[PDB]
Amino acid sequence: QLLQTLTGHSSSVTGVAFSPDGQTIASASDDKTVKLWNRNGQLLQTLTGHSSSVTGVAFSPDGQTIASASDDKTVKLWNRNGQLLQTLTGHSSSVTGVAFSPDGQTIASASDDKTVKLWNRNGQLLQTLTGHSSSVTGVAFSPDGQTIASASDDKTVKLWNRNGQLLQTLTGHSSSVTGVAFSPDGQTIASASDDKTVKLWNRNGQLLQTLTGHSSSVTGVAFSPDGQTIASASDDKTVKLWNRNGQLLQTLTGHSSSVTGVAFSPDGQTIASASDDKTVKLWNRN
Ligand SMILES: [Cl-]
Ligand SMILES: [Cl-]
Ligand SMILES: [Cl-]
Ligand SMILES: [Cl-]
């Protein structure tokens, strides 16, 4: 059920994240800003500095660092006062996503330059993971931090260890993979794809399930904190909720354009969805 609509961005909203305490929402947007919101929907700050569209946003687990990915080829790190701390340069094309390791001391970035780059918390470039043959669209850490998952326009998910050694390539999607997520218990990987499906995989690389129902590209996927519910965002303007057995639970309609990402609150009580209609919408579990 729709709880709140966050209006303020002047262009498409490309991503959304909850602060670790769940009291602050961060939105990324094509208007070159990240915005920080409260639960009532009141805008708190606007983070300016990127020279192009912002494609993703993430909080460090301690809640003290905000990372933003941008088409200007950089990741920028900010404090909770909206002040710029650092700019991570190195990617040769647009940065499409960013994520913090579970211990918060390593940062992974995905780029259209076909690589994932691993960075220390304080900006040092650690590794460049090469293997994808097209743009990398998203990245995620396993909750034990021992594995990294990367989604790519080359239609695969790749699984890496923290040395940057490629462990698995997940093959099955018919078009670009747009996002990837680990289940909280780490046993399940979910992938979203332009082929209109979500696919569920085990860490041994085996296809478990294909979640069908969306009528356009699936742009993102997320696991509830308890691991029992899957949320999918789609260019068909909806968010869909599924169970671990692939059954469609319910469909969240309300956005007037494509939904670009989705996230659960840390406490599992709220779903946030970002849309090309320039808003973030907050939903309850019912
Ligand atoms: Cl726009
Ligand atoms: Cl490419
Ligand atoms: Cl870690
Ligand atoms: Cl939950």
Author numbering: 1 to 286
Sentences from the paper on this structure:
β-Propeller proteins are common natural disc-like pseudo-symmetric proteins that contain multiple repeats (‘blades’) each consisting of a 4-stranded anti-parallel β-sheet. In the larger propellers a so-called “Velcro closure” is found, in which the N- and C-terminal β-strands are part of the same β-sheet, keeping the propeller closed. This “Velcro” can occur in different positions; in the “Velcro 1-3” variant, the closing β-sheet consists of one N-terminal and three C-terminal strands, while for the “Velcro 3-1” variant, the opposite is true. Starting from a highly repetitive β-propeller sequence, we designed a consensus motif sequence that formed a perfectly symmetric 7-bladed β-propeller.
While the space group and packing differ between the crystals, the structure is identical for each protein. The crystal structures also show that the proteins are highly internally symmetric with a backbone RMSD between individual repeats below 0.3 Å. The characteristic hydrogen bridge network in WD40 repeats, between a conserved histidine, serine, aspartate and tryptophan is clearly visible in the electron density, see Fig. 4. Analysing the thermal and chemical stability of the WRAP-T permutants revealed that nvWRAP-T, lacking the velcro closure, is just as stable as the variant v13WRAP-T. While v31WRAP-T is considerably more resistant to GdnHCl induced denaturation compared to the other proteins, its increased thermal stability is not that significant. From this, the fraction of denatured protein could be calculated by assuming the protein is completely unfolded at the highest concentration. When possible this data was fitted with a Boltzmann-sigmoid curve to determine the concentration at which 50% of the protein is denatured and the proportionality constant (m), see Table 2. v13WRAP-T remained stable at high GdnHCl concentration thus fitting the data was not possible. A striking difference however is the stability of the “non-Velcro” variant, the least stable for Pizza but as stable as the natural “Velcro” position in WRAP-T. This may be due to differences between the sequences, as the two different “non-Velcro” variants of Pizza have different stabilities as well.
